[PDB]
Amino acid sequence: MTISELLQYCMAKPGAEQSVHNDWKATQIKVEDVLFAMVKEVENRPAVSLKTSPELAELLRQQHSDVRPSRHLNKAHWSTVYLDGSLPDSQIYYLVDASYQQAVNLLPEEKRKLLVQL
């Protein structure tokens, strides 16, 4: 699937802004200072790195190889999913909201109250 639409869909999540790191244009999707997922194309192939997530870490225990959770940034504290392009959109959308849900839970009272209005 195309990351072009996926990225725009990430902007449809209330509270998420794009923080671009001007090196290889790694784009961090986060709120005020809570980073849950960041997208970075390596090998010219789409790849997103999520923060420590239950199902994402579970994927590494239960399933192996193929997508290859690798240590380009941090393999145990982060998880890098090679989106590649040949990966189905069905799974990707779920992963986005998975990390997004976590971010909201990790936000204090003040922060959460705001997102509820949006």
Experimental method: NMR
Total domains, the chain: 1
Say how far apart CA 59 and CA 76 lie, in whole Å. Answer: 12
Cα–chain-centroid distance for residue 25? 15
The per-residue DSSP string of 40-55 comes to --BTTB-EEEEES-HH
Based on the number of CB atoms within 10 Å of its own CB, is 105 exposed (0-12), middle (13-18) or buried (19 or more)? exposed
**What are the strands of the beta sheet with 26-30, ordered from one edge?**
17-21, 26-30, 35-39, 47-51, 78-82
- Quick count: other Cβ atoms within 10 Å of Cβ 79? 25
Say how far apart CA 90 and CA 70 lie, in whole Å. Answer: 22
- Quick count: other Cβ atoms within 10 Å of Cβ 23? 7
Q: Give the CATH number for residue 33.
A: 3.90.1150.30
Q: Which residues pair with residue 48 across a beta bridge? A: 39, 81
Q: Are 16 and 7 in contact (CB under 8 A)?
A: no
Domain extent, residue 95, equals 1-118
- Between β-strands 26-30 and 78-82, what pairing exists: parallel, antiparallel or unpaired? unpaired
